[PDB]
Design a protein around this ligand. Sequence first.
Ligand SMILES: [Cl-]
Ligand SMILES: [Cl-]
Ligand SMILES: [Cl-]
Ligand SMILES: [Cl-]
Ligand SMILES: [Cl-]
Ligand SMILES: [Cl-]
Ligand SMILES: [Cl-]
Ligand SMILES: [Cl-]
Ligand SMILES: [Cl-]
Ligand SMILES: [Cl-]
Ligand SMILES: [Cl-]
Ligand SMILES: [Cl-]
Ligand SMILES: [Cl-]
Lengths: 217, 217
Amino acid sequence: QGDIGIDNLRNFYTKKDFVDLKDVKDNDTPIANQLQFSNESYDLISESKDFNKFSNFKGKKLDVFGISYNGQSNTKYIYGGVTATNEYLDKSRNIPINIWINGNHKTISTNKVSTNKKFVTAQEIDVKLRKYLQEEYNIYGHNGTKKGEEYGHKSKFYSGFNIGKVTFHLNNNDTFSYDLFYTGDDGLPKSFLKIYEDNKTVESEKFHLDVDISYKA
Amino acid sequence: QGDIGIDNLRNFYTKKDFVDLKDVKDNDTPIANQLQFSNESYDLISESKDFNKFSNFKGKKLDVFGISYNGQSNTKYIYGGVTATNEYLDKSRNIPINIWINGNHKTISTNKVSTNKKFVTAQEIDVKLRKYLQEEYNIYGHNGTKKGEEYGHKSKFYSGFNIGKVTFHLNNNDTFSYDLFYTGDDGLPKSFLKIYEDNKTVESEKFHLDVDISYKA
Ligand SMILES: [Cl-]
Ligand SMILES: [Cl-]
Ligand SMILES: [Cl-]
Ligand SMILES: [Cl-]
Ligand SMILES: [Cl-]
Ligand SMILES: [Cl-]
Ligand SMILES: [Cl-]
Ligand SMILES: [Cl-]
Ligand SMILES: [Cl-]
Ligand SMILES: [Cl-]
Ligand SMILES: [Cl-]
Ligand SMILES: [Cl-]
Ligand SMILES: [Cl-]
C-alpha cells in the first residue's frame, strides 16, 4: 500500500550508522565480484561490477565506507565503498558545495562532508551529503529538529522537496550525478544502493559538488 | 552466540504442526494445574494457571489446539489450548482482520484464520494468524516463497518487520493484545508460549482482530 522507499531512504541515508572501516584486510576469496571483511560478529561483503579493481584489491588492506544492508545469518552487504591504503591527505578536506534550494544558489562547506582519502568513493561523499541535507533542510522529512521547517511538509516524505540531484564536478570538464529521491524499482536498499556498485572514486582535492533540491506538485 | 528466539518463533509458529485434538477425554489426574491427553505414542500435558477451569474440565471430553513443545520421554507440553465439547458453530467463521502494514490499513478474512468452536482459545486464533502472516508477509523471514519479498530483509529475522501486535477486539469492548515478536527471557518455547497459560477464550462470533506490523531501527 505505502511506498517503502520513503522510510528506507530516510533510514538508510540518515539514521542507520554508515560503514566506516579503515585498513581492513580482504579475505581473498575466489569470488570475482565480492570483497569480504570479517569481524567477530559478522562478515561485511562488498559487491562491485568492477571485477578488475576487485581483483587488484584481493587480500589487500583497504578502507570501506558507505551504507550496508542485511545479509543472511552473520553477513551484511555494501555496494562498492572500497579504497586502497597507500596514501592519504594530511588532513580532512571539506568538499566545497554549490547548492540550489528552490532555484536559489548559495555556497557551503562543512566538516560534515569531508574526507582525508586521496581518492574517495563517490558513495562516501554522497551518503555524507544526504545526511547533511536531511539535518539542514529536512529533505526526507521527520529529521526531529526545527531545521528545514521553513520549507514545509507538502512532499510524500513530509518535507518541502521531492526532486533533487547531486552532481560531482571533476577538474575535467566531466561530471556525473545521482538522483536524491531515487528509490529503485521496489524501494529496497538492495535496489537503490546499487548505484554504488561501480565503486566510482574521485580525486578528493580535485572536485566539488553541485546540489539541487526542489519541488514539483 | 545467536538469539535462539528468532529460529524458535519461526519454527514453533510457522513450521511445526499445531496440536489439533477434538473430543479427547482428559485422564482425570489429581494434578491441579494440568490436564492430560493420552495416545499410543505420547501424553499431551496442558498447563494452565486457571485451576478452577481445569478442575471443571477434569475427566471431560475436550478440544485442544495450539503449540506443543517437548517433554521428557513420551510427553509433550502445551500451555492451555483447551475448550469444552458442548456446542459448536454450524460452520467455521473466518475471523475479520483489520491489518496495518507499515501504517497502511486494509481488511482481510481468510479460511486460514477460522474456527467452528463457540468459544475458541485466543491461542488457536493467534497461532493460526501468525502462520498466515508468515505466509503472506514473511514476518519471521525465510518463508520459502516470494510472498512478502517487497518488504525486504532488514530485520534480524531476515524480514521487513521487527515490531508487531495482535489485538483481540471483543464486542464490549475490551481488548487484549500479544506481541508478535516476543521471545520471552531466553527464546525458548517454555517461556514464550507461557502467554497462553491463562487458557483465555473468546466468543467466536463476537470478536475481530486488529493486527499491526512495522519496523524500527
Ligand atoms: Cl538469516
Ligand atoms: Cl582507491
Ligand atoms: Cl508545505
Ligand atoms: Cl511528493
Ligand atoms: Cl509522514
Ligand atoms: Cl531497480
Ligand atoms: Cl576525479
Ligand atoms: Cl520442532
Ligand atoms: Cl470452553
Ligand atoms: Cl466466514
Ligand atoms: Cl530491506
Ligand atoms: Cl531487528
Ligand atoms: Cl469474548
